[PDB]
């Protein structure tokens, strides 16, 4: 049971590194988001007061319960007639979000039957889509293997892999998203990263804004791009332990010599 | 590539799910969307000083309000959602540098968290191994897997959902719904435990840490069950065609 002691040491150290990494990212995001927050938090109260004052004739407090009744929309007399969010197409993009575990959450089920089905549908879809993604990844890895046909040559081959990768699966689809969805250059690249890393905040969605040839390419862009980041995230993880183990040899060697 | 036709089965599984969700969600959509129209007209008539016009400006500036959070701790939990690939989206980055940092922070954190979760999973798999090597011939393997899934759904689904039901104010289904959506790394964000003061939220993120390793094992077994079912349906298709050809010969 000595190897179990050796495992628990490594596990606890990784968890201490993860916490540090989380603390670092925490401080950086809040040092990047708190400023625009407080500006918006004060300029929304300016608009509250300047439209309570212009119209004190509401039962003034209901503005806040009104806003609550509007955060439930999370309509107007103009275009009181819309299209669905669970139409013949969006439900098949939402079934895709469930099995891919990207879960943008822009439209989530509200029926108890829908919630229970979504649970069973995920528990069966996540493994099934895993076999699909594995088959697609093996297929594309052999397409790359055919096209690439000692250690220095294989580093060059990994470089040209990552290059065509960001070209086909990052550059081109982001430009397509920038064109049709009307996003910026960063918003497109941000959307590509958040989608194919299976994070999917839902702040940007390709099928959210209201050609029907658009989407069949989207979910099958998503399918193959997931195989791509799967390889890329695996290479990044491999890079992390190589750096991690050689920083461990350097610290042990640093300490040991102690400037002679 | 004949095996790679799983694609087509996945597309069916999607088309099937599609027809089910629109048969489960588009109805109440209409009920909700017609009960919103009634509310608006109930607000212009009941408040005649507010006109058609002031309402539109109000709705616009609140849809803009859709775009305290990022506090000393909520940014830590955002980072937790980033590396776990759960990404509730309840609080998303808006700064240009915040977006780029979020990109880089994910590309580097997701592998790191993968190593952590792998270490926690191996550690918990051996903790499980100690208990079951004691409680646990060919048939017994099924009972052992039953005891795994049974006692795991207790610790990582039942008990934390009851905790969420009481404390967070959800239903039994909303709790179980949240548990699955979270620990399957899907995370729509419709329900978030700490999305709606340093003790409820770290206990959850430690739960999340260990429950992810739990569903990871559960999802892998289910995939293995699917593999067994698929091979045994293939051998049954070969049986059916073989005797159907037998019969045609007769
Ligand atoms: C990002 C942290 C770098 C050092 C890792 C922890 C060293 C103990
Ligand atoms: C005991 C192992 C510590 C490793 C820290 C590495 C920092 C880059
Ligand atoms: C859930 C039922 C799917 C039908 C099985 C597919 C056999 C080719
Ligand atoms: C190859 C046949 C797939 C059957 C899947 C059924 C899962 C309920
Ligand atoms: C409430 C149960 C709904 C059934 C969906 C398969
Ligand atoms: C040590 C097991 C914890 C289950 C929640
Ligand atoms: K998500
Ligand atoms: K989300
Ligand atoms: K994952
Ligand atoms: K995921
Ligand atoms: K996700």
CATH class for the domain made up of B1-250: mainly alpha
Q: Whose Cα sits closest to atom 1 in ligand 1?
A: A21
Q: Where are the alpha helices (DSSP H) in chain B?
A: 6-22, 26-44, 52-66, 74-83, 96-135, 140-153, 159-164, 172-183, 200-249
Smallest CA–CA distance, residue B10 to chain A, in Å, is 7
Method underlying the structure: X-ray
CATH class for the domain made up of A1-260: mainly alpha
Count other C-beta atoms under 10 Å from residue A82's C-beta. 9
Check if the beta carbon of residue B21 is closer than 8 Å to that of residue A91: yes
Are B73 and A26 within 8 A, CB to CB? yes
Q: How far is CA A96 from CA A27, A101, A102, A232, B68, in A?
A: 34, 8, 9, 22, 33
Are B49 and A27 within 8 A, CB to CB? no
Which residue has tokens 């995920």?
A122
Cα A204 to averaged position of ligand 7 atoms, centre (Å): 11
Which residue has tokens 């045609």?
B248
Cα A11 to averaged position of ligand 7 atoms, centre (Å): 27
Q: Residue A125, SS3?
A: helix
Count other C-beta atoms under 10 Å from residue B66's C-beta. 9
The encoded tokens of residue A254 equal 């640093």
Query: Which of A10, A12, A20 has most ligand 1 atoms within 8 Å of its beta carbon, as the pocket-test mutant?
Result: A20
Which residue has tokens 């037998």?
B246
Torsion-angle region of B216 (φ positive above 0: left; ψ -120 to 50: alpha; else: beta): alpha
Q: Is A30 in the pocket of ligand 2 (CB under 6 A)?
A: no
Are B85 and A233 within 8 A, CB to CB? no
Q: What ranges do the domains of chain A cover?
A: 1-260
Count other C-beta atoms under 10 Å from residue A128's C-beta. 19
Q: How far is CA B135 from CA A19, A86, B125, in A?
A: 36, 48, 15
Check if the beta carbon of residue B184 is closer than 8 Å to that of residue A101: yes
Q: Whose Cα sits closest to atom 4 in ligand 2?
A: A248
Write out residues 114-153 of A within 8 Å (CB-CB) of B: 114-119, 121-132, 135-136, 139
The encoded tokens of residue A37 equal 């927050």
Which residue has tokens 């926690």?
B120
- Which ligand is located closest to the Cα atom of residue B16? 3
Which residue has tokens 């270490």?
B119
């Amino acid at each position: 049971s000595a190897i179990n002691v050796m495992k628990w040491k490594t596990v606890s150290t990784i968890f201490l590194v993860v916490v540090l990494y989380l603390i670092i990212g925490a401080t950086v995001f809040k040092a990047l988001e708190q400023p625009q927050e407080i500006s918006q938090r004060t300029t929304i109260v300016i608009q509250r007061e300047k439209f309570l004052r212009a119209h004190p004739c509401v039962s003034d407090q209901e503005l806040d319960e009104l806003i609550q009744q509007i955060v439930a929309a999370d309509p107007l007399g103009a275009s009181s007639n819309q299209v669905s969010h669970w139409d013949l197409g969006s439900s098949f993009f939402f079934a895709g979000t469930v099995i891919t575990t990207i879960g943008f959450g822009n439209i989530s089920p509200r029926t108890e039957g829908g919630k229970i089905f979504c649970i069973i549908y995920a528990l069966l879809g996540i493994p099934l889509f895993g076999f699909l993604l594995a088959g697609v990844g093996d297929q594309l890895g052999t397409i790359f293997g055919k096209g690439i046909a000692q250690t220095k040559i294989r580093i060059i081959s990994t470089i040209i892999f990552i290059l065509f990768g960001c070209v086909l699966f990052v550059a081109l689809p982001a430009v397509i998203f920038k064109h049709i969805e009307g996003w910026s250059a960063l918003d497109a690249i941000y959307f590509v990263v958040i989608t194919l890393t299976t994070i999917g905040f839902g702040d940007y969605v390709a099928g959210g804004s209201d050609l029907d040839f658009y989407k069949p390419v989207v979910w099958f862009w998503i399918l193959v791009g997931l195989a791509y980041f799967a390889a890329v995230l695996s290479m990044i993880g491999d890079w992390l332990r190589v750096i991690a183990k050689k920083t461990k040899e350097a610290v042990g060697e640093f300490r040991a010599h102690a400037a002679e």
